[PDB]
Amino acid sequence: KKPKLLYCSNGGHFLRILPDGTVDGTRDRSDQHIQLQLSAESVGEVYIKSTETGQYLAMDTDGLLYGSQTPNEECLFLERLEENHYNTYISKKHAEKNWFVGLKKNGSCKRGPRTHYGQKAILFLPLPVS
Ligand SMILES: O=C(O)[C@@H]1O[C@@H](O[C@H]2[C@H](O)[C@@H](NS(=O)(=O)O)[C@@H](O)O[C@@H]2COS(=O)(=O)O)[C@H](OS(=O)(=O)O)[C@@H](O)[C@@H]1O[C@H]1O[C@H](COS(=O)(=O)O)[C@@H](O[C@@H]2O[C@@H](C(=O)O)[C@@H](O[C@H]3O[C@H](COS(=O)(=O)O)[C@@H](O)[C@H](O)[C@H]3NS(=O)(=O)O)[C@H](O)[C@H]2OS(=O)(=O)O)[C@H](O)[C@H]1NS(=O)(=O)O
C-alpha cells in the first residue's frame, strides 16, 4: 500500500473526494483529490481514505457516497475481482442489497441502489501514482 488512483473504466474518470465530503470522478489527473490510500483491515475488506484531506470514503443508508472524517462501519468495503480483472468495491454494511461504489459515465457518483453486479460503472482499476 502506497497511495493509488481509482480509475473507473466507465467514462474514464478518477475517483475523487472533494473537501466538502462530496464524492465524484474527474478526468483531471492533476486534481489534488484523487490520491487515495487503501487500508486493509482484514483479508477482504479495505478502507479508502483520501491522502489530501484524510477523509474516508463512505456510504450512507441511502446508497449515497460521501467523505467521512471518521472510520465507521459505513466506511468499510469488500474488494472483489470481476472476471475481467477489474476491482469492484461493495459496501460491507449494505452487502446484501448489492450496492457498490460506482461512477456514472458522465462522472457523477452512481447511487448505491442504482448499481449492481456486472455493470461497467463499478469496474475500478487501481492505478499507481509516483
Ligand atoms: O448506454 C450507455 O450509455 C451505457 O450503457 C452501458 O454501456 C454498455 C455499452 O453501451 C454496450 N454497447 S452496446 O453497443 O450498446 O451494446 C456494451 O459495451 O456494454 C456496456 C456496458 O454495459 S454492460 O457491460 O453491462 O453490458 C453502461 O451501463 S452500466 O455500466 O451498467 O451503467 C454505461 O456505460 C452506459 O449507461 C448509462 O446510460 C444509460 C443510457 O442512458 S441514456 O444515454 O440517458 O439514454 C443508462 O441507462 C438508461 O437509464 C436507466 C436509468 O435511468 O435508470 C435505465 O432506465 C430505466 O430505469 C430507470 C430507473 O428505474 S427504477 O430503478 O426506478 O426501476 C427509469 O427511470 C427509466 O425510465 C427506465 N427506462 S426503461 O428501462 O426503458 O423502461 C435503463 O437502463 C436505460 O434507459 S434507456 O433505455 O436509455 O431509456 C445507464 O444507467 C447509464 N449508466 S451510468 O453508469 O452512466 O450511469
From Swiss-Prot:
It is found in: Secreted; Cytoplasm; Cytoplasm, Cell cortex; Cytoplasm, Cytosol. GO terms for molecular function: fibroblast growth factor receptor binding; growth factor activity; heparin binding; integrin binding; S100 protein binding. A motif (Nuclear localization signal) lies at residues 1-4. This is Fibroblast growth factor 1. Predominantly expressed in kidney and brain. Detected at much lower levels in heart and skeletal muscle. GO terms for cellular component: cell cortex; cytoplasm; cytosol; extracellular matrix; extracellular region; extracellular space; nucleoplasm; nucleus. The chain holds residues 24 to 153 of 155 of the full protein. Plays an important role in the regulation of cell survival, cell division, angiogenesis, cell differentiation and cell migration. Functions as a potent mitogen in vitro. Acts as a ligand for FGFR1 and integrins. Binds to FGFR1 in the presence of heparin leading to FGFR1 dimerization and activation via sequential autophosphorylation on tyrosine residues which act as docking sites for interacting proteins, leading to the activation of several signaling cascades. Binds to integrin ITGAV:ITGB3. Changing residue 10 to A: No effect on integrin-binding. Changing residue 79 to A: No effect on integrin-binding. No effect on integrin- and heparin-binding, loss of FGFR1-binding, defective in inducing FGF1 signaling, cell proliferation and cell migration. Its main location: secreted. The keyword Phosphoprotein applies. Signal peptide: none annotated. GO terms for biological process: activation of protein kinase B activity; anatomical structure morphogenesis; angiogenesis; branch elongation involved in ureteric bud branching; cellular response to heat; epithelial cell proliferation; fibroblast growth factor receptor signaling pathway; lung development. In the nucleus, phosphorylated by PKC/PRKCD. Residues 104-120 are annotated as: Heparin-binding. Keywords: Acetylation, Angiogenesis, Cytoplasm, Developmental protein, Differentiation, Growth factor, Heparin-binding, Mitogen, Nucleus, Phosphoprotein, Secreted. The keyword Calcium does not apply. Belongs to the heparin-binding growth factors family. Monomer. Homodimer. Interacts with FGFR1, FGFR2, FGFR3 and FGFR4. Affinity between fibroblast growth factors (FGFs) and their receptors is increased by heparan sulfate glycosaminoglycans that function as coreceptors. Found in a complex with FGFBP1, FGF1 and FGF2. Interacts with FGFBP1. Part of a Cu(2+)-dependent multiprotein aggregate containing FGF1, S100A13 and SYT1. Interacts with SYT1. Interacts with S100A13. Interacts with LRRC59. Interacts with CSNKA, CSNKB and FIBP. While binding with LRRC59, CSNKA and FIBP seem mutually exclusive, CSNKB and FIBP may cooperatively interact with FGF1.
